[PDB]
Amino acid sequence: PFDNTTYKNLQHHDYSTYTFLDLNLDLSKFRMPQPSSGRESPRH
Amino acid sequence: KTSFGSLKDEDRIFTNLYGRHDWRLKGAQSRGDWYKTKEILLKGPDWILGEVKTSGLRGRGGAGFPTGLKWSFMNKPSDGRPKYLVVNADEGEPGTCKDREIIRHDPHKLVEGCLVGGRAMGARAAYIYIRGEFYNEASNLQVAIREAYEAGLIGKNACGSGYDFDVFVVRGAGAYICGEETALIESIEGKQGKPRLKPPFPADVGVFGCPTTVANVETVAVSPTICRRGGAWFASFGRERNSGTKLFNISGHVNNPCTVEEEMSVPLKELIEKHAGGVTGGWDNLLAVIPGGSSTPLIPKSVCETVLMDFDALIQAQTGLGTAAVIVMDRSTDIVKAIARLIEFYKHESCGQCTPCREGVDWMNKVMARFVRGDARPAEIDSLWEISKQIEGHTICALGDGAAWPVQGLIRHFRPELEERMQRFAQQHQ
Amino acid sequence: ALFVHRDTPKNNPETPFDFTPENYKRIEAIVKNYPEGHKAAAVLPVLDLAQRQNGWLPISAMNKVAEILQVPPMRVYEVATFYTMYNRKPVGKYHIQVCTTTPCMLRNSDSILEAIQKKLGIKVGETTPDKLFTLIEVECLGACVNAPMVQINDNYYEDLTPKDIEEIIDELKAGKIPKPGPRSGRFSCEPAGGLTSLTEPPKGPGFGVQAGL
Amino acid sequence: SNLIEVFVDGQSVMVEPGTTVLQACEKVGMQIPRFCYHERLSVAGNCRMCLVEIEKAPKVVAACAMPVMKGWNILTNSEKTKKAREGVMEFLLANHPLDCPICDQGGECDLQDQSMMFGSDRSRFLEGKRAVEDKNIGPLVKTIMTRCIQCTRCIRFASEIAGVDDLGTTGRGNDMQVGTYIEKMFMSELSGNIIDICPVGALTSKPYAFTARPWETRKTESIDVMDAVGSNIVVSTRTGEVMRILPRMHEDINEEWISDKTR
Ligand SMILES: NC(=O)C1=CN([C@@H]2O[C@H](COP(=O)(O)OP(=O)(O)OC[C@H]3O[C@@H](n4cnc5c(N)ncnc54)[C@H](O)[C@@H]3O)[C@@H](O)[C@H]2O)C=CC1
Ligand SMILES: Cc1cc2nc3c(=O)[nH]c(=O)nc-3n(C[C@H](O)[C@H](O)[C@H](O)COP(=O)(O)O)c2cc1C
Ligand code: SF4
Ligand code: SF4
Ligand code: SF4
Numbered sequence A: 001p002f003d004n005t006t007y008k009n010l011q012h013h014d015y016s017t018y019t020f021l022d023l024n025l026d027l028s029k030f031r032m033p034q035p036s037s038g039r040e041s042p043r044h
Numbered sequence B: 001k002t003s004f005g006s007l008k009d010e011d012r013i014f015t016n017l018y019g020r021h022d023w024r025l026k027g028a029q030s031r032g033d034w035y036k037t038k039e040i041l042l043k044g045p046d047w048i049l050g051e052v053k054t055s056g057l058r059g060r061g062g063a064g065f066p067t068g069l070k071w072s073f074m075n076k077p078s079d080g081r082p083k084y085l086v087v088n089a090d091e092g093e094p095g096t097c098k099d100r101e102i103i104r105h106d107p108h109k110l111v112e113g114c115l116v117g118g119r120a121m122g123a124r125a126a127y128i129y130i131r132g133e134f135y136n137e138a139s140n141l142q143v144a145i146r147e148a149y150e151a152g153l154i155g156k157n158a159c160g161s162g163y164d165f166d167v168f169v170v171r172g173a174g175a176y177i178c179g180e181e182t183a184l185i186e187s188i189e190g191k192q193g194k195p196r197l198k199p200p201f202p203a204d205v206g207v208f209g210c211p212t213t214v215a216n217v218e219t220v221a222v223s224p225t226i227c228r229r230g231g232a233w234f235a236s237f238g239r240e241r242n243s244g245t246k247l248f249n250i251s252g253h254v255n256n257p258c259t260v261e262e263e264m265s266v267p268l269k270e271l272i273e274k275h276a277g278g279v280t281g282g283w284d285n286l287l288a289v290i291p292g293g294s295s296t297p298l299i300p301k302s303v304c305e306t307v308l309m310d311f312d313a314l315i316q317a318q319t320g321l322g323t324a325a326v327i328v329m330d331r332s333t334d335i336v337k338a339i340a341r342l343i344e345f346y347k348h349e350s351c352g353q354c355t356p357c358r359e360g361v362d363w364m365n366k367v368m369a370r371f372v373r374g375d376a377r378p379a380e381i382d383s384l385w386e387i388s389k390q391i392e393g394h395t396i397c398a399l400g401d402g403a404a405w406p407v408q409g410l411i412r413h414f415r416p417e418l419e420e421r422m423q424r425f426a427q428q429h430q
Numbered sequence C: 001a002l003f004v005h006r007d008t009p010k011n012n013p014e015t016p017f018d019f020t021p022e023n024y025k026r027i028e029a030i031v032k033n034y035p036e037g038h039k040a041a042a043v044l045p046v047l048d049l050a051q052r053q054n055g056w057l058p059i060s061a062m063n064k065v066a067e068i069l070q071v072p073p074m075r076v077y078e079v080a081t082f083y084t085m086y087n088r089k090p091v092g093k094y095h096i097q098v099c100t101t102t103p104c105m106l107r108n109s110d111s112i113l114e115a116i117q118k119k120l121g122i123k124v125g126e127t128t129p130d131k132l133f134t135l136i137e138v139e140c141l142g143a144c145v146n147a148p149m150v151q152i153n154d155n156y157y158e159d160l161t162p163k164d165i166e167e168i169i170d171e172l173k174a175g176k177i178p179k180p181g182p183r184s185g186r187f188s189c190e191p192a193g194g195l196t197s198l199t200e201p202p203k204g205p206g207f208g209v210q211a212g213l
Numbered sequence D: 001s002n003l004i005e006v007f008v009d010g011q012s013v014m015v016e017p018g019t020t021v022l023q024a025c026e027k028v029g030m031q032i033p034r035f036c037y038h039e040r041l042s043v044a045g046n047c048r049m050c051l052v053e054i055e056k057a058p059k060v061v062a063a064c065a066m067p068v069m070k071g072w073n074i075l076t077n078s079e080k081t082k083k084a085r086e087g088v089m090e091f092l093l094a095n096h097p098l099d100c101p102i103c104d105q106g107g108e109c110d111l112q113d114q115s116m117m118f119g120s121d122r123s124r125f126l127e128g129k130r131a132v133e134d135k136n137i138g139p140l141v142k143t144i145m146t147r148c149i150q151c152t153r154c155i156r157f158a159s160e161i162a163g164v165d166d167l168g169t170t171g172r173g174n175d176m177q178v179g180t181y182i183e184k185m186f187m188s189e190l191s192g193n194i195i196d197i198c199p200v201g202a203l204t205s206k207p208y209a210f211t212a213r214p215w216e217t218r219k220t221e222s223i224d225v226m227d228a229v230g231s232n233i234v235v236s237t238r239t240g241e242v243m244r245i246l247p248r249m250h251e252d253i254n255e256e257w258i259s260d261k262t263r
C-alpha cells in the first residue's frame, strides 16, 4: 500500500529536553577510542 | 542541452524531501541509501575523489568552490594528527531552510555521505555541527546515527570494509557566524565563534589543529548518490561548470513557499511559476528577488525575466547563487525597510572580531535606519556605497561581504526610490 | 541586554547549582566525544546542559562548567555571552522566539508579534508576571518557507496566523503541549496546493547504479 | 640556504620561510601600520590596519598574519593599500570618543599618530557613538573602555605572558566588551604592562593619571634596582621631578616588560 499522503515524521512530537543528550549517552558505547594529543590540556 | 529545468523524480537525489516516507533505516534502505556502500569504500579514496571531480559538484554552501578539488586537499599522507570531516549544518541564512529538510527527512543519506566523504579524505570521524535551534532535527539525526551504528554501517568496521569512522553531532548555540567554517571550527573547540584568518586553511590546520574539511549538508549528502549513479550522471545536469541538482527555498511573496529539488540552470521565472505557485498578484506584481539568501544582492524584475539559477548566470547578473534561497518581494514591499531589516540581522549576527564588520555593519545599519524614514540627504547614498566598499574584502570572513552586498544591490537597483523617500521626508518635515 | 555581571542575591557565585548524577553521566558522554587534551571542546554542550537542568545560567553554572572541564572561568563567560541561547537571566517556562527577519517579515510576522503581545499582555523582552512566558524577538530560525513561525523552547510553530498562535498560547496556559509543525494545511515544506514534485514512488536500491560497482 | 626571494615595492629581499609580509617589509626598513599586531604576542589579525596590496592579487592581505610566498611584490604605498588604511582608520575612529584632551594617551597615542599618518583628515560618521561601561580591574590600571578599539592585546598579554586567563571579550558585534565580565581585580606581577601595549588610552596608569603629558617629559635611560634582574627602564621626568617609569627593550633581560614594583 503506497502511502504518499501522511507525514511519517511524527516522532519529534515525543521528544523531551534530554533527548539529544540521552542519545549521546546511548551512542557513547559504539564509538572508537579517542585520539590523544599527548598532554592533558594546552595549559598542561 | 540549452533549456534546463523540468527535473524528473527518478533523477532526484533527495527523495523523501517532504516527510511522506519513512526517514529511518527501513525507509532509507528502501529508497536506495546504504546500498553498495562497502563497494564504494573499498575502491579507494582516489576513485571517490575522481567521481566527485568528474561530477562537477560545487560547494552547496554557497561559495561554489569545486567540491572534488576541495576534498582532494586532504588526500595526502598523515603526520600523526587525525583527520576530520566536519559537516556544516548551521544554515543561518535568511531564506535558506534546505539542510533542515535534509537532516530531518533524509538523515541516513547525510550519514552515508559522511562515511563516503570521510573515506574519500581519510577522515577519522565526522563532526556534524548542527544548529542548536534545530533541536528536533538533531535528535532526529541522532536516532538515524544510532540506527547506523546498530547496523554496523558506521563505527568499528564501517559497512564491513575495515574502515573505522565515527559520526558525532555537535549542537550550536545561536550564532549565524558559526556557520562560517573557521568560526564553526572554533565553536566546536569550546570558544567564541570567531573566524580564523586564512591561511591556514582547515585542510592544514582545522578542528583541534588537525586536517579538516568543512562541507555543507547538501554537498555531503549527494556524494553517495554521485558515487552510485556516477559522475557523468550528476554532471549531465545544468550548464557547464554548473553541474547537478539543487535544493531551492522559495519564500517571501509567493503563493506557495516551498523547498523543492530542481535541475541546476532552471530559469528563475520558471522555478517560481512552476514549483512555488508564482508571485502573489501575478508576475507583473514582482518587484525584486533576492536570489540566494540574504547575502546575495537583489535583482529586480527586469533581470529576473531571463535569469538562470546557477552560479555563473547570477554572477553575470551581478549577484551570486549562494544557498539558492529565492526571497520574492512584490510591489507592495517597503524594500528599503526589508534591506534595512537585513542589515539589522547582519549586525546582530556579527562576531565583533575585526574592525570593518564590527564598526561598519552597525554604521550601515544606522544609515539604513535613517534611509527607511528618509532622514538623510542624497550625498549620503554614495557615501554608504563607499562604506560598503570599505567592508568588502577588508574583513576576515565573508560576513562583511554578505553585509556589504545587499546595500550595494539596493543602491544599484533602487537609488531613485531612496531619493524620493528622502525628498518627501524633507518636504513634509521642513 | 548587559554583557557584564553584577552579583545580585539571586545570581552570585554562592547561588546553589550542581548537576544531577544523570547529568554527570551525560557530561561524561559529551566529554568522550572530543579528543584527549581538548576537553575545552565540551564547553558549549555541557553549559547548554546546565541551561536544560536549570532553565537559565547563573554564575554558578558557568563556574561549575569551568571547574569540571578544567578551563578558566573567563573562557566560559565568553561562550555564555557570545551565544544567544544561553539565558543569563531567568526567563519564563515557555520562551517564545518570534522570527522577524526579511523572509518572515514579508509574510507578516509583525501581526503575530503584536498578537502575542496583546494576548500575553506584555511586549518584546518582557516576561508575563506568572513567570510562564518570555517574549523576545530573534533572527532567522531557518524555517523560511514555513514563514511566519515562532519557536517555543525546542519546537517550531510554523505557517502561523494570529488565531493559530492564540490557540497555541491557550493550550500552553492549559498545561498541554502543542504539536510542533505548520499550522496551515501542509505537513512540512511542500507546496501548499499539492505536490509539484516527488509524486512518483522512490525507485529503491540499485536504481541507476553505474557499472563497475 | 632556504631563503625565498620576495619583493617590497619592487625591492628584492631574502627572507626565511614562514616570515610574514610585515616582517619582510620591516627588513627593508618600512614599518606597516598596526594596532593588534605585537611582536611579543600571538598574531591576532583583528584590527585590519595592516592590510597591504600584493600585486597581481585582487584582495589585500593582513600583513601581520599572511606568510610571504616566493615572488610576491608587496606594495606598501599603492593606491588600494592607502584606501584600505583610510577605511580601517575611519571605522576605528567612528565610535571612538573625543577624549584626546582629557586622555592620558594624547601625544603618545598610536591611534592619533597613525590616523595622522595613514587615515584621512575628516569624518563622515553622522551618527551617535557608543559608550561603554568602565571596569575596575585594580588600583594600578585605570580603565576607560569607551576608548577601547578591541585589539585584544589585553587578552593575549594576560593569557600568554602574564599567564592569567582572566581578561576576555564578552558580547558580540559592536557591543563586544573587553573585560573580566565580573568585578575582578587584575593584580598580576606584570599587570601594569598592559598600559604599555594598549595602543589607545583605554588602559592608562592610575598613578601617572592626569599629571604629565609625553612631549614635555625628559627621557633618562636607567636601570631597575627593585630586584636583581637589572631591567632597563626609562625614567621620564618633567622639570626636575620624576614622572613615571617605562621599560626599555633589552632582548636578553626584560624583553620589553617591567614588573609592577618597578613601574
Ligand atoms: N550555506 C549557508 O547557509 C550560507 C552560505 N554562505 C555563503 O558562503 C560564502 C562565503 O563563505 P567562505 O567559505 O568564507 O568563502 P569562500 O571564498 O572562501 O570559500 C569556500 C570554500 O573553499 C575553500 N577555499 C577557497 N579558496 C581556497 C584555497 N585557495 N585553498 C584552499 N581552500 C580554499 C574554503 O576553505 C571554503 O571551504 C558566500 O558565497 C555566501 O553566500 C553565507 C552564509 C550562509
Ligand atoms: C557568515 C557565513 C556564514 C556561513 N554559514 C554557513 C552555514 O550556515 N551553512 C553552510 O553550509 N555554510 C555556511 N557558510 C559557508 C561556509 O563558510 C563553507 O564554505 C561551507 O559551509 C562549506 O563549504 P562548501 O560550500 O564548499 O561545502 C557560511 C559562510 C559565511 C561567510
Ligand atoms: S567580519 Fe564580522 S563576521 Fe567576520 S571575523 Fe570580523 S566581526 Fe567576525
Ligand atoms: S586613545 Fe588616542 S585617539 Fe583616543 S582619546 Fe586618547 S589620545 Fe585620543
Ligand atoms: S583595552 Fe586596549 S589593549 Fe585591550 S583590547 Fe582594548 S584597545 Fe586593545
Ligand code: FES
Residues within 6 Å of the ligand: B093, B094, B095, B096, C099, C100, C101, C102, C103, C104, C139, C140, C141, C142, C143, C144, C147, C149
Ligand atoms: S526568516 Fe524567519 S525563519 Fe528564516
Ligand code: FES
Residues within 6 Å of the ligand: D033, D034, D035, D036, D037, D044, D045, D046, D047, D048, D049, D050, D051, D062, D063, D064, D065
Ligand atoms: S595588525 Fe594585522 S590586523 Fe591588526
Ligand SMILES: [K+]
Residues within 6 Å of the ligand: D105, D194, D195, D196, D197, D198, D199, D200, D201, D202, D203, D204
Ligand atoms: K595605553
